[PDB]
Amino acid sequence: FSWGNYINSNSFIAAPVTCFKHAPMGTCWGDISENVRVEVPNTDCSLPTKVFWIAGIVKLAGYNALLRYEGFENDSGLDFWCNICGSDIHPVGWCAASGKPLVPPRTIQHKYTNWKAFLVKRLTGAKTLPPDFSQKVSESMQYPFKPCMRVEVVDKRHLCRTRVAVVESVIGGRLRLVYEESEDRTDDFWCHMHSPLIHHIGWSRSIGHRFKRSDGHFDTPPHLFAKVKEVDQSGEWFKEGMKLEAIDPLNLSTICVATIRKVLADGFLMIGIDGSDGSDWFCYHATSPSIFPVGFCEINMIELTPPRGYTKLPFKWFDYLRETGSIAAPVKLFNKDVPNHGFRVGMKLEAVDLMEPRLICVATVTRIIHRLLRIHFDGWEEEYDQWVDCESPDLYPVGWCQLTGYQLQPPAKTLDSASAQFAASALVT
Template sequence: MNFSAGPGASDHRPSAPARLMENPRDLVERPSRKRRDSFGMLDGLDEDRSSCSTESSAGSGASSPEDSEDEDLGGVTQLTPSSSSSLTLIKTNGQVYTYPDGKAGMATCEMCGMVGVRDAFYSKTKRFCSVSCSRSYSSNSKKASILARLQGKPPTKKAKVLQKQPLMTKLAAYAQHQATLATVKASNAQILSVEVFDWGRYLGGGDVMGAPVSCFKHVPMGKSWGDIGEGVRVEVPNTDSGLPMKVYWIAGIIKLAGFKALLRYEGFDSDSTRDFWLNLCVPDIHPVGWCAAGGKPLVPPQTILHRFTNWKTFLIKRLTGSKTLPPDFSSKVQESMQFPFKKQMRVEVVDKTHLCRTRVALVEQVIGGRLRLVYEECDDGTDDFWCHMYSPLIHSIGWSRSIGHRFKRSDVSKKLGGQMDAPGQLFAKVKEVDQSGSWFEDGMKLEAIDPLNLSAICVATVRKVLADGYLMIGIDGSEAADGSDWFCYHSTSPSIFPAGFCEINNIELTPPRGTTDKFCHSLDEKLDVFKALVFFFKSKTIIKNCLYMCPEPKLMSLHS
């Protein structure tokens, strides 16, 4: 079903066709060829579906979209209604233009930043790509509408940024963006190729609740997820088109579970038979308007094709007042997938065979902020393990010497080509502690989580006080004679506690190996003067829990 947009009063330029359906050169050589639907909707169905009828509409005058203010929704973009019945795409002669290499004959719209053939631009001055951009520029107003989005018009907020940038700056930024996109795409392909677990089948119809992405500040998009939630509209591949080529349709988010979204195509209403799960951070997810901007066809699912005869009117009515992804959502995802740690960076990391010391390791892979580390002396790369880039197990080169920690010197005499020490600012920072007055001393007793058995809190001893608030801790009753199983904890670590912590919280304390006494209620008498005082533990939460001094909790405003 094809829709034709009426010709504008000021510029009579054909709308952009679906990129996959026609060769742009054909339209340039034959300008009298029938104009395609400005939405790109149902392009090519005349050839593939005999049951589809053709509708066309024409107008003698052009109307401008109603002025409307874009609302900042923090992660989503508001779609507002428009009174325009015929808006011209920022395309010329059916050609979908991309950023050029600076050759003559090109022009850049001073309003939206679109680059195209100069002769095809609006007005004698060729400053703008369309009447809409010219009016928006002169009145400095914000124009956003559903029709404009479906026809690929860039948002005004983005445009205002673009018009302040010189052409060469934008070209350089675009070139860098393309290089980054290629790298991320290859990386994502590698990651997705090894995914075997079907989250969609496991989550079912949405009855299971998934933790939202905004809860995880250390993951990609964790700090910029915004208001993405149920009801947001996106453009996704249409798997129910019955066509041989890849086409798209608009879908709404029904349920969110982490990065995964349960989607339903527009037009299915309460029918959930075609619902499907899709990761919102994959390349196939786009904001409303992406198809028209890139010359991609919007095609309704064939299951519901018979329900409406005018899909253009249906979309305008359905999308009025709804939200979509911000236009830069894809670039934000790509940026969030870039991590400061790079391959062949050198770090100091805990020796997994001797927890009391560190050794040099090389970063071999960086995926999702997780590092695959290989010890420097390992030639075949098999002596490896994974940890997060914010893990307290890794440190900058020279860290061990600076605090007095044991360190295994590498047999490698010099760095190989391409290797470099990871900058110190990349590592997680620990809180500074006030060591004036009373402080930890060698031999003091305390309670600590066993690093080899994280479910157990054990009786432990401070074996060595290091610099910058670090401590070497040994688990009583199971220490090696040479101290090779001592573990380094910072004094602010939530893994160490004062003597008596387990007792007041009714937690079973693991006694030293070989003893039969219950330590839950009599540890204080056995430790005497060697127990670590509560004063040394700077965590206010631990202090209040231990002394039963926690004040009445206060409610915090969700908007604060």
């Protein structure tokens, strides 16, 4: 499987890197656009040694760039895909700086006679990578989470409690965790290091969350954990028994009828899916975009999943509130920003399968409802589509798996004339 070929064959569009709050280089992507010029190996050569040429970005698909050698003009016949963050991608001037040769592609070697004048007139006023781009890329893939670090995380077999887990490995900022005293040896849980699921040692005791009573393993420094958003300070709050709609943490395809079962400290809530010990309950922060007011699904034309075993169907909230003698959580408690992240229906990305989070897959955004993206797994049925927040750390740009070395599941300031002249000095015909 090749993202470039899939995108070129189908005329697909990819979500830009800047759409992704948590993506490597998200906040250094201003320099990257169509017509940026780079120095890259010239594969259109039969020379003993590796040589380079200039190429321009024809198309960007996340981290992946479709490049055209300079001097091909409109001739797309040798257009090639690369990861723009790859180590063979250099700013213009890198050859002259490094004593490497710029050699015309063989295909166009007689198309121009004065190669130095050609390069000067093409490179003068061009956009290239910043000189530290390479270093920003290397820094974007140093993660402060390390093997042997301990965290608190939900027990996937008993959502109502946490237990301690250890980092086994870190790939692209994703943690492979094993539970301490696990039922098996290894590989129990995958999440992003900025997942809201993981907490400092002491978190559960501190907020009132149930926990399983408890090499070289050490407590993750508390400062490494994602900040929790502050709640509305008015003095009106969630109460036990209030009704709402929530994403089922065991079925990310469904939004369900739900109940506030316990108010914890620091804005955390134990929530139950109605009709399904207290063993079932799962913790959402009050600022979670995975919870919604009564009537959210109906107003936004989303299927609501009714309580397991409830027989007055199709489900009507007015009747269920009266039958159960309960009230809706006030709509004001769920007000939040909808960032302008620039996702559009049809855009391609790499998505975590949240029902099997080890898998990162070829995926499409197929619906947008404020913050909420409907994520489709290309080649699978729509029934397996998942509800995912637009700022989720489980969504990646096209090319993220290639950048970080994670396995991808396939579908089922311009240069001045002195800079141009400097760059062109590396020319060997």
